[PDB]
Amino acid sequence: VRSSGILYINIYPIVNYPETIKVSAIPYYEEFLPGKWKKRIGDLIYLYGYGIENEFDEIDNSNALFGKIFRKYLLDILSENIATPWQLKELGSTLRLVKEITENYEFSNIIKLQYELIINVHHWQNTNFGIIVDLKINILDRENNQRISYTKIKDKYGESVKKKIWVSVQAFHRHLTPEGKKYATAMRDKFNLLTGLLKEAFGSSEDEKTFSTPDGEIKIVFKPLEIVEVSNN
Ligand SMILES: [K+]
Ligand SMILES: [K+]
Ligand SMILES: [K+]
């Protein structure tokens, strides 16, 4: 006798995107500063999105080049749609966004806690795209904004601060209640926290969010991808 189930994963799918995009190829010179709206592929740089200046060609999603360009294009568009109070931490092969935790916690005067969303593009079955999103909570010494270990918190501020911060961090991850206890919806709440912070970071007030591009809309659905297996006993 076998079990059946549903798996939710931290991949949020792009359900609509422009299947053809404008590109402009220029010869690759090392002298050109890399940045948003341009991607080197071999001996060419391809401009795309807001990087399109006067002229252009087009590629569609059957082209090998399309995935290479679109992955980067998608993060560049996401980086134009960050909602306050989130801020850009890094845009490279990954997009990282941060928000300071402004909910009350003991010792928030000396220890700063910060959400960090880590966003990577996933590309599968030739034409499917999505974002894989991880969440971290950074623990910072408020007075100097540097990362601080629990060991250093104990050394600098005392054991009582180290213990209260650990409970608060665990509660902000949804591993514990505010009272420092385990609880029956913790694992569900942990995933719902990730989805809710991601929606907030992109200004999403419904399950689906549209982002404008010069090639047409990109639509993401801010629900975890779901995979269902039903066993036949
Ligand atoms: K919060
Ligand atoms: K504070
Ligand atoms: K889904």
Residue numbers in the entry: 15 to 247
From the paper:
Comparison of this 172 aa ORF to a homologous sequence found in a nearly identical AfAgo-encoding genetic island present in the genome of a related strain A. fulgidus DSM88774 revealed that it contains a premature STOP codon due to a 2 bp deletion. To study the structure and function of the full-length upstream protein, the restored full-length open reading frame, with the missing TA nucleotides inserted, was cloned into an E. coli expression vector and the corrected protein was subsequently purified by liquid chromatography. We were able to solve its structure by X-ray crystallography in two symmetry groups: P1 (resolution 1.85 Å) and P3221 (resolution 1.4 Å). Two full-length upstream protein chains found in the asymmetric unit of the P1 structure, and a single chain found in the asymmetric unit of the P3221 structure overlap with an RMSD of 0.85 Å (determined using PDBe Fold). We henceforth refer to the full-length upstream protein as AfAgo-N. The upstream protein (AfAgo-N) is the structural equivalent of the N-L1-L2 domains of long pAgo proteins.
Here we focus on the prokaryotic Argonaute AfAgo from Archaeoglobus fulgidus DSM4304. Although phylogenetically classified as a long-B pAgo, AfAgo contains only MID and catalytically inactive PIWI domains, akin to short pAgos. We show that AfAgo forms a heterodimeric complex with a protein encoded upstream in the same operon, which is a structural equivalent of the N-L1-L2 domains of long pAgos. This complex, structurally equivalent to a long PAZ-less pAgo, outperforms standalone AfAgo in guide RNA-mediated target DNA binding.
